[PDB]
Amino acid sequence: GAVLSFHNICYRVKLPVEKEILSNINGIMKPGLNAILGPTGGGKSSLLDVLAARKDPSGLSGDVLINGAPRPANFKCNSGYVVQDDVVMGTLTVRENLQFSAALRLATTMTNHEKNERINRVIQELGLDKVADSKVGTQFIRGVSGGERKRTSIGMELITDPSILFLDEPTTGLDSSTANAVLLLLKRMSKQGRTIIFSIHQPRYSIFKLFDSLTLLASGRLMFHGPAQEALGYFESAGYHCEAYNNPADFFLDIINGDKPLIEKLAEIYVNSSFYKETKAELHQLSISYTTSFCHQLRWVSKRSFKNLLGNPQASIAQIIVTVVLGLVIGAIYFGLKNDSTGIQNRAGVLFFLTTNQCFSSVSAVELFVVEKKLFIHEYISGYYRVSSYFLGKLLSDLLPMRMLPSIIFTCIVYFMLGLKPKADAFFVMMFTLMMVAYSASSMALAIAAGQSVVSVATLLMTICFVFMMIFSGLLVNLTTIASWLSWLQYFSIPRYGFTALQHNEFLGQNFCPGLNATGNNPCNYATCTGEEYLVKQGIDLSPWGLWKNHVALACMIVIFLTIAYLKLLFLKKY
Amino acid sequence: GAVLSFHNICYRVKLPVEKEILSNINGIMKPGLNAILGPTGGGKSSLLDVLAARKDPSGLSGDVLINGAPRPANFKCNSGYVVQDDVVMGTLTVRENLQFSAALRLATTMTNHEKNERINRVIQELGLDKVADSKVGTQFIRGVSGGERKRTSIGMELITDPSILFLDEPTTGLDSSTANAVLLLLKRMSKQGRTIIFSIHQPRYSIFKLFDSLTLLASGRLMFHGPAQEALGYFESAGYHCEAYNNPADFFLDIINGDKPLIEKLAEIYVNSSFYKETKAELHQLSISYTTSFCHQLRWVSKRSFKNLLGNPQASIAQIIVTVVLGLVIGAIYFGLKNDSTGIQNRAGVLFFLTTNQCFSSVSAVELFVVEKKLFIHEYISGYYRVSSYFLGKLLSDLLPMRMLPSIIFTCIVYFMLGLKPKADAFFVMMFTLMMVAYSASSMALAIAAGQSVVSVATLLMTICFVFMMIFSGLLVNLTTIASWLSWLQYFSIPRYGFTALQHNEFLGQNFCPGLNATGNNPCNYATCTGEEYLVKQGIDLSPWGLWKNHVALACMIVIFLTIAYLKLLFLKKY
Ligand SMILES: Nc1ncnc2c1ncn2[C@@H]1O[C@H](COP(=O)(O)OP(=O)(O)OP(=O)(O)O)[C@@H](O)[C@H]1O
Ligand SMILES: Nc1ncnc2c1ncn2[C@@H]1O[C@H](COP(=O)(O)OP(=O)(O)OP(=O)(O)O)[C@@H](O)[C@H]1O
Ligand SMILES: CC(C)CCC[C@@H](C)[C@H]1CC[C@H]2[C@@H]3CC=C4C[C@@H](O)CC[C@]4(C)[C@H]3CC[C@]12C
Ligand SMILES: CC(C)CCC[C@@H](C)[C@H]1CC[C@H]2[C@@H]3CC=C4C[C@@H](O)CC[C@]4(C)[C@H]3CC[C@]12C
Ligand SMILES: CC(C)CCC[C@@H](C)[C@H]1CC[C@H]2[C@@H]3CC=C4C[C@@H](O)CC[C@]4(C)[C@H]3CC[C@]12C
Ligand SMILES: CC(C)CCC[C@@H](C)[C@H]1CC[C@H]2[C@@H]3CC=C4C[C@@H](O)CC[C@]4(C)[C@H]3CC[C@]12C
Ligand SMILES: C[C@]12CC[C@H]3c4ccc(OS(=O)(=O)O)cc4CC[C@@H]3[C@@H]1CCC2=O
């Protein structure tokens, strides 16, 4: 089968400040059951990642040679990597997660019936039949414990039918007789050609027999590499005796920890050993395309995020409910506005609140998008889909429906309850304008929080930007008294465009005076008797170009921010 | 030493829907080294909690008898409980955490020098000298690994000099030769009278010798209880043989898992065993005050939260910085307001924004308070302090300084930059009013989010309430057109009181007309020529009672909400 091999592996990590993890490991793997066993945080996951082509190639001083020839281009297609920290999506069922992996990472012509057959096979083999359709962990719903979740994580890669396999701590938290079941499964599979590579913590001596090739790492340096049955012989020759300890693994790990630095002494002793010579001799003897179409990747990512949204209420149902309640409350407060000395303040207040609420709502959904960062990274480097597919899928999942909906709710209730402009064109223009401001706010939210780690800083920055934009809306300050050298910032406010468009189609045919015919017989200034005078004092144009110009400014903002978000994703250091 | 004993322990957990965890355990502990070893999620933490008096006594059908006499009142004073999930505060150093525990849970007359001596002793013994003053984990700052963190958690109770000790999975993630160090320490201590009780996952056969009394739990039922050296004899008699397996613990746990339900068969076999008779025979043979003063508990909790705030920037430094920047920006935008046709809109906008920003800021700090819920619960049931002490400590830590500060910043910048009322009394009234609204918003935040689990729902509810309150502020809707049967809600708005008080001392001596002397020669209505006419149209009283009444309404809201928060804490199911 696959014969991975490496030569002079080294690595460095930037703390301008740099360190070395993994100092100079020289070794060969083989088809069968290979292993990496060493002290925690000594270089176990690091080496596994480096072998899996999952770290930035600005540190692997050295190489990797599959069967001699360099890493084939489909290497990430032909191998599975079981992560160490359970990147399984919490709001789905187990069977749906496995369906997801099977649908994306397998062939196309395979009938769905056979995919389900394989899924049931994995479900039985991993010991998951009871929780097969249960719900994985969530903050609201307590879910299956680590055992079932980790077995889910392992199944997600086991379903891929890989010809190479990688695992990082496959049994951490698995119960003693379920870890044994897992490893007996692995050993049974590792007799058909699959080259298994994994780390492990304190295996049982029964497990220890199953191994073929063993590798000890402690503080980067390679300590031993050879068959597990001769690990004992090596240490026995180098002045140690087995019989005192009964589980070889503990004898090995105690030797490392002292049961003039020792680690270097062990390293320089190994480099003097015959195994090293055999390693060097054979080593010198020896010397992206995705599976399924774009439409399919789009379909399946969109469906998964549909399921996630329906499963998560605090961003989907909570928003709709608070929107309905606010619509009703506002319909009650300002009910039946009067064309009177109060109508101007009332109308400006209503329009400003609708606009600013449409703006500030978008933060919740972008938080739900941000928390997917690590999951997305792991799914990408594992070769699921293209970046563009993930992007458009998330768009059609959340940004399209959950933001198009509240605007319809708000207009359909408020508009006729509050007695705004009574024609139809004004109704639909209000509806469309609210849609536009919602989408633009979402786009800015994405472009700010596309590629960020922590959700609290993203939220803080987003709220700061939105506050700065709404300060320029036009209600809080009369825009014609802002100084000359600061007015230019008025063009950068989404609420400005939205609120301006809303006022322009509302105030246009209005007059707020006791009797319009003979209220001008005493034509005092500072009167605002007609609506248009109020519109002018706020600095707004009157020909339809004012309204449509606001709309096109909003559309341009949408497109620009979406492209910026896509670029921040594409160039992100996806490692 | 202490001889805990129990009889007919049972428990139930409400899923109106109920289950049984821990079915009918009957057993004795003794001074020395006792243990609980059984399959994961089979009843190991549950029993330990029940013995530790840490579950609601609506399920312990049965009893616990220390040396025969019932549980003494200082039982939570004389025992330490090492939790399973690392409730150590992430933003402190290790030595400061241990100082905290030593200062609260030990005597008073002990000189601080000796407390530090004990701390160094524990630091050496637990293997923590290197990270003794490092920083525990944080999102912003990567921190010491679980090994060091778990040793910190264990030290926090080991410093108490307890005459009884409890541990739940003391070694999960500890390195093989550090787990061995921990357990050799425990065994060495368990020869001086301390009655150690702990669970464990897959101990080594070397460790297995150290035990004195063993206890196997699998699906609630008691499987075996007797010395670890005769556990083998029991199973050997009941048709099993040891030699096939080399680590007794794995032989035991494999027997449970099948290496006609078996679990009940084992239970009914045990109840027929001689050990059961000895247990029954001896069992039938056998048959809160805090340490330090209030001032001291207050001092130390306040100091710890001081350290936490300084260590956390996103709620302490970020707020001050954004406040300064907003102060400068607002000072620039409205610079030098004019008593002119725009002054009314400008002034109302500035005052409304200041008020609503003071209101909406309080959410961050209350989030930081909410995330302390589980930590507070664990520290209370462990007998650190009184509830009132924790409450007043958190108040003097966060609510006092971090909310008193921004108001001073805002007034000192904005007030003179924007040319508001130019006397001093108005300056200080604005300052005091902003302080009051800040405190009232914080109080409502606490009373809403005192005793809540998830931070996202608390934030959502809080923002909904704040939005509903500001809708009634007076800028967005003219309060005299709200219907009769909804006006009463105007008294429930903090922004209403704050904004009203701010407008009342500002608009009072003002007139917004071209030339005041002969602008009334054309006395048209809908003019708002003087400020007071604007004040009246908004429905505000003019005698000083308007201003002071707003202040007293705010003070009453503060007191009411603080008492409500304290009651929600006190009656909380602190188990
Ligand atoms: N990205 C990183 N940043 C900072 N330090 C790192 C980074 N990667 C490794 N290190 C450091 O290198 C040392 C070894 O890390 P390593 O990844 O090999 O532990 P590990 O293999 O994952 O052990 P385990 O699998 O049990 O968790 C660690 O002490 C760690 O501090
Ligand atoms: N408060 C509870 N609510 C619901 N179920 C519970 C509760 N306490 C226990 N259980 C149930 O009882 C079973 C056993 O729980 P238990 O506490 O004994 O696991 P455990 O001892 O803590 O195992 P481990 O220590 O490794 O975590 C679990 O399956 C759990 O679902
Ligand atoms: C019902 C209306 C009037 C309440 C106002 C909206 C807020 C307060 C309500 C509306 C719907 C509610 C949510 C409905 C469903 C769930 C799922 C549950 O497992 C946890 C609570 C949670 C997340 C609720 C939290 C509170 C919530 C968001
Ligand atoms: C990176 C982000 C913030 C880029 C900001 C670009 C925005 C502000 C740009 C994109 C298109 C631009 C608009 C293009 C056309 C018009 C119509 C014109 O008669 C007035 C200016 C106006 C309305 C522009 C204002 C600025 C504008 C809206
Ligand atoms: C638009 C303007 C005002 C944005 C203001 C952002 C400033 C005030 C905020 C944004 C993100 C914040 C940073 C977030 C994380 C860290 C890392 C930590 O180890 C030190 C504090 C530090 C560096 C914070 C300091 C305050 C900070 C820089
Ligand atoms: C739990 C929450 C909603 C408590 C609500 C309490 C509020 C509404 C209470 C607390 C203090 C009260 C105020 C105390 C004093 C005055 C001054 C008086 O000349 C008019 C009534 C007025 C203004 C009261 C109105 C009601 C009031 C504001
Ligand atoms: C209340 C409001 C939503 C949120 C408000 C807000 C929220 C945070 C804030 O500052 S912040 O520190 O929380 O970042 C300031 C403001 C000022 C006005 C703004 C709106 C007026 C109408 C509206 O619906």
Numbering used by the authors:
A (entry chain A), B (entry chain B): 34 to 48, 58 to 301, 326 to 353, 367 to 654
Which lines from the publication concern this structure?
ABCG2 is an ABC transporter of broad substrate specificity expressed in various tissues and tissue barriers. ABCG2 also functions as a multidrug transporter and exports a wide range of xenobiotics and pharmaceuticals, thus strongly impacting their pharmacokinetics. Here we present cryo-EM structures of ABCG2 under turnover conditions containing either the endogenous substrate estrone-3-sulfate or the exogenous substrate topotecan. We find two distinct conformational states in which both the transport substrates and ATP are bound.
The turnover sample containing E1S revealed a single, well-defined conformation resolved at 3.4 Å resolution. The conformation of the E1S-bound structure was very similar to turnover-2 from the topotecan-containing sample. We, therefore, refer to the E1S-bound structure as turnover-2 as well. In the structure containing E1S (turnover-2), the substrates could be fit in two orientations related approximately by a 180° rotation. When compared to the previously reported structure of E1S- and 5D3-Fab-bound ABCG2 in an inward-open conformation, E1S appeared slightly shifted (~1 Å) towards the leucine gate and thus towards the external side of the transporter. In the topotecan-bound ABCG2 sample, the dominant class (88% of the ordered particles) belonged to the turnover-1 state, whereas 12% particles belonged to the turnover-2 state. This suggests that turnover-1 is the lowest-energy state of ABCG2 in the presence of topotecan, whereas turnover-2 is the lowest-energy state in the presence of E1S. Given that E1S did not promote the turnover-1 state, we concluded that ABCG2 can directly proceed to turnover-2 when smaller or endogenous substrates are bound. For these substrates, turnover-2 appears to immediately precede the rate-limiting step of the transport cycle. In contrast, the strongly reduced size of cavity 1 in the turnover-2 conformation would lead to major steric clashes with bound inhibitor molecules. Figure 5 reveals that whereas there is sufficient space in turnover-2 for bound substrates (E1S or topotecan), the inhibitors MZ29 and MB136 could not fit.
